[PDB]
Design an enzyme around this catalytic site. Structure first.
Site, mmCIF file in Angstrom:
data_model
loop_
_atom_site.group_PDB
_atom_site.id
_atom_site.type_symbol
_atom_site.label_atom_id
_atom_site.label_comp_id
_atom_site.label_asym_id
_atom_site.label_seq_id
_atom_site.Cartn_x
_atom_site.Cartn_y
_atom_site.Cartn_z
ATOM 1 N N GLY A 140 0.783 -1.234 0.000
ATOM 2 C CA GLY A 140 0.000 0.000 0.000
ATOM 3 C C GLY A 140 0.811 1.278 0.000
ATOM 4 O O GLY A 140 0.257 2.362 -0.175
ATOM 5 N N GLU A 165 -0.214 0.723 -13.552
ATOM 6 C CA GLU A 165 -1.067 -0.459 -13.710
ATOM 7 C C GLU A 165 -2.507 -0.013 -13.871
ATOM 8 O O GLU A 165 -2.855 1.108 -13.509
ATOM 9 C CB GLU A 165 -0.975 -1.383 -12.485
ATOM 10 C CG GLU A 165 0.223 -2.310 -12.476
ATOM 11 C CD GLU A 165 0.293 -3.194 -11.234
ATOM 12 O OE1 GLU A 165 -0.562 -3.059 -10.337
ATOM 13 O OE2 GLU A 165 1.213 -4.031 -11.160
ATOM 14 N N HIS A 168 -8.126 -9.435 -2.139
ATOM 15 C CA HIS A 168 -6.709 -9.666 -1.901
ATOM 16 C C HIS A 168 -6.501 -11.131 -1.537
ATOM 17 O O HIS A 168 -6.837 -11.569 -0.430
ATOM 18 C CB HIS A 168 -6.211 -8.750 -0.784
ATOM 19 C CG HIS A 168 -4.720 -8.661 -0.684
ATOM 20 N ND1 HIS A 168 -3.896 -8.673 -1.790
ATOM 21 C CD2 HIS A 168 -3.907 -8.513 0.387
ATOM 22 C CE1 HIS A 168 -2.640 -8.561 -1.401
ATOM 23 N NE2 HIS A 168 -2.619 -8.464 -0.085
ATOM 24 N N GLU A 225 1.372 -12.366 -3.843
ATOM 25 C CA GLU A 225 0.151 -11.563 -3.666
ATOM 26 C C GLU A 225 -0.548 -11.318 -5.000
ATOM 27 O O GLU A 225 0.085 -10.874 -5.970
ATOM 28 C CB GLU A 225 0.447 -10.208 -3.027
ATOM 29 C CG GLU A 225 0.915 -10.240 -1.584
ATOM 30 C CD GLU A 225 0.919 -8.858 -0.947
ATOM 31 O OE1 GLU A 225 0.334 -7.910 -1.530
ATOM 32 O OE2 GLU A 225 1.500 -8.714 0.143
ATOM 33 N N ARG A 237 9.450 -13.046 3.202
ATOM 34 C CA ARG A 237 9.422 -13.401 4.623
ATOM 35 C C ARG A 237 8.283 -14.386 4.902
ATOM 36 O O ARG A 237 7.383 -14.539 4.089
ATOM 37 C CB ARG A 237 9.204 -12.138 5.455
ATOM 38 C CG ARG A 237 7.869 -11.431 5.125
ATOM 39 C CD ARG A 237 7.736 -10.094 5.773
ATOM 40 N NE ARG A 237 6.438 -9.481 5.502
ATOM 41 C CZ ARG A 237 6.115 -8.822 4.393
ATOM 42 N NH1 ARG A 237 6.987 -8.655 3.409
ATOM 43 N NH2 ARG A 237 4.905 -8.297 4.277
ATOM 44 N N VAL A 272 2.746 -12.545 9.024
ATOM 45 C CA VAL A 272 1.820 -12.543 10.138
ATOM 46 C C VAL A 272 0.769 -13.652 10.000
ATOM 47 O O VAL A 272 0.562 -14.418 10.932
ATOM 48 C CB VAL A 272 1.106 -11.164 10.242
ATOM 49 C CG1 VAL A 272 -0.005 -11.191 11.290
ATOM 50 C CG2 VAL A 272 2.109 -10.047 10.559
HETATM 51 C C1 LIG Z 1 -6.879 -2.635 -4.214
HETATM 52 C C2 LIG Z 1 -5.422 -2.739 -4.603
HETATM 53 C C3 LIG Z 1 -4.473 -3.016 -3.601
HETATM 54 C C4 LIG Z 1 -4.806 -3.241 -2.161
HETATM 55 C C5 LIG Z 1 -4.366 -4.434 -1.580
HETATM 56 C C6 LIG Z 1 -4.627 -4.709 -0.239
HETATM 57 C C7 LIG Z 1 -5.324 -3.782 0.526
HETATM 58 C C8 LIG Z 1 -5.760 -2.591 -0.044
HETATM 59 C C9 LIG Z 1 -5.499 -2.313 -1.386
HETATM 60 C C10 LIG Z 1 -3.121 -3.132 -3.920
HETATM 61 C C11 LIG Z 1 -2.692 -2.966 -5.221
HETATM 62 C C12 LIG Z 1 -3.613 -2.682 -6.217
HETATM 63 N N1 LIG Z 1 -3.127 -2.537 -7.467
HETATM 64 C C13 LIG Z 1 -3.953 -2.273 -8.496
HETATM 65 N N2 LIG Z 1 -3.447 -2.133 -9.737
HETATM 66 N N3 LIG Z 1 -5.280 -2.136 -8.294
HETATM 67 C C14 LIG Z 1 -5.819 -2.265 -7.061
HETATM 68 N N4 LIG Z 1 -7.163 -2.094 -7.060
HETATM 69 C C15 LIG Z 1 -4.988 -2.563 -5.946
#
Ligand SMILES: Cc1c(-c2ccccc2)ccc2nc(N)nc(N)c12
Length: 446
Positions: free
Chosen positions: A166, A201, A209, A276, A292, A295
């Protein structure tokens, strides 16, 4: 097996690692700050070394002090846990250069996964599905950058290559905001990562997720251990994790798991790791890899029977994986609720002395925490103080057990998120399952 190891971490994960070591007959060295002398794992360790004062920079991030502790105790390996130095390639390199085993992949592999642009290129090459994107860093030519955004199609998202979890990203919904969004992401990346590289992206609107657990040894074996749904989160902090992910079929699990394992072989991956993904409309899109142990690893352990920390240690000693892919079966369902010392209205850390403590018990109930009655949660470290993990034959049983366990949990003297967790377990959309990454923040907003 490794004779002796330094546990280069604290709190619940340090205790987790100590237990795994004890099971394998590995001697433990607990390095700790001056504020952490009465940590449960410190009190249980074979040897202890105070590596510095409370602030993490002089203790848990203090590379010379940690390596020195390994030297003086005659330890052979260092387990970094999660957070702190666990994704620090320079640290891994120094550990190996100093003659100790780093419990993780090769330093070059850590570095690769820490470079989000290069990691994506490697994954795409290996056949792992990725998010449509720039496939390379953005330059300063805004005509070119607008063309890339048009090709992808708005909305898009700008991301720092040195970021992840994030950190260092922003959403762009039209040309008018593109230049400024790129400039600001770049400036923030320079300031935070000393690396101003950014990429683009497609911004997925309502994904889940979903991450894949892998294990790879030094004998060429690489397996996947199903998936975890981590969509229940606030501001990129996971709150509840579960395994398997609701609605994912055995065929999808096979499809994506095989691609991750194949990628591990291609890149010479070693140890535990996490792929991920964003999951939307039945499709997976790789965003990031973690090297790693994380959690949320315990939910995967419950549904597969594999002890992931013990596997890490066996791998580091040169032993092959204790299980083959055909011996990995998803059975039942597991839910993890993170227990945080936090204020319910602000969500800020709420440190303090625990005056009364009671852990839940029973069939399918697993409590992962260093806390005890009279223990003081210090202000200098993360707010997560424990993890409650409940397993059942199906998701409904896992959730029912979680509800009961949360009701037995007593943590007086400090403010916690136990009540919030109870609310989530009682949430009708959560009970249905498959809520997206935005759900918790929307629930809290209402
Ligand atoms: C939603 C999102 C997350 C994201 C992952 C975990 C918690 C909160 C946001 C991370 C990367 C992300 N990348 C793209 N291209 N698009 C999303 N919608 C995104």
């Amino acid at each position: 097996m490794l004779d002796k190891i330094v546990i280069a971490n604290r709190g619940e994960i340090a205790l987790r690692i100590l237990r795994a070591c004890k099971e394998l007959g590995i001697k433990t060295v607990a390095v700790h700050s001056s504020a952490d002398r009465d940590l449960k794992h410190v009190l249980l360790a074979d040897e202890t070394v105070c590596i510095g004062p409370a602030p993490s920079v002089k203790s848990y991030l203090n590379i010379p002090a940690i390596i020195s502790a390994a030297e003086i105790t005659g330890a052979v390996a260092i387990h970094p846990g999660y957070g702190f130095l666990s994704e620090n390639a320079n640290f891994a390199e120094q550990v190996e250069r100093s003659g100790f085993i780093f419990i993780g992949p090769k330093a070059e592999t850590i570095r690769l996964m820490g470079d989000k642009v290069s990691a994506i290129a490697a994954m795409k090459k290996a056949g792992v599905p990725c998010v449509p994107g720039s496939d390379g860093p953005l330059g300063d030519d805004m005509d070119k950058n607008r063309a890339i955004a048009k090709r992808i199609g708005y909305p898009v998202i700008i991301k720092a290559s040195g970021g992840g979890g994030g950190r260092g990203m922003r959403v762009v919904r039209g040309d008018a905001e593109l230049a400024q969004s790129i400039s600001m992401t770049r400036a923030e990346a320079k300031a935070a990562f000393s690396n101003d590289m950014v990429y683009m992206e497609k911004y997925l609107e309502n994904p889940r997720h979903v991450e894949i657990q892998v294990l790879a040894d030094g004998q060429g074996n690489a397996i996947y251990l199903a998936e975890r749904d981590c969509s229940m989160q606030r501001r990129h902090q996971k709150v509840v994790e579960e395994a398997p992910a609701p609605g994912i079929t055995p065929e999808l699990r096979r499809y994506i798991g095989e691609r991750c394992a194949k990628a591990c072989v291609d890149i010479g991956y070693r140890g535990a790791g996490t792929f991920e993904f964003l999951f939307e409309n039945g499709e997976f899109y790789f965003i990031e890899m973690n090297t790693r142990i994380q959690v949320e690893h315990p939910v995967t352990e419950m549904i597969t029977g594999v002890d992931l920390i013990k596997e890490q240690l066996r791998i580091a000693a040169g032993q092959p994986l204790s299980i083959k892919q055909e011996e990995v079966h998803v059975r039942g369902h597991a839910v993890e609720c993170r227990i945080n010392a936090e204020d319910p209205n602000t969500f800020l850390p709420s440190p303090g002395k625990i005056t009364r403590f009671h852990a839940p018990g029973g069939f399918g109930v697993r409590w992962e925490s260093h806390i005890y009655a009279g223990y003081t949660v210090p202000p200098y470290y993360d707010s997560m103080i424990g993890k409650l993990i409940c397993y059942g034959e199906n998701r409904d049983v896992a959730i029912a057990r979680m509800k009961n366990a949360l009701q037995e949990l007593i943590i007086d003297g400090i403010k916690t998120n136990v009540d919030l967790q109870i609310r989530i377990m009682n949430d009708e959309n959560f009970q249905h399952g498959g809520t997206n990454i935005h759900y918790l923040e929307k629930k809290l907003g209402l």
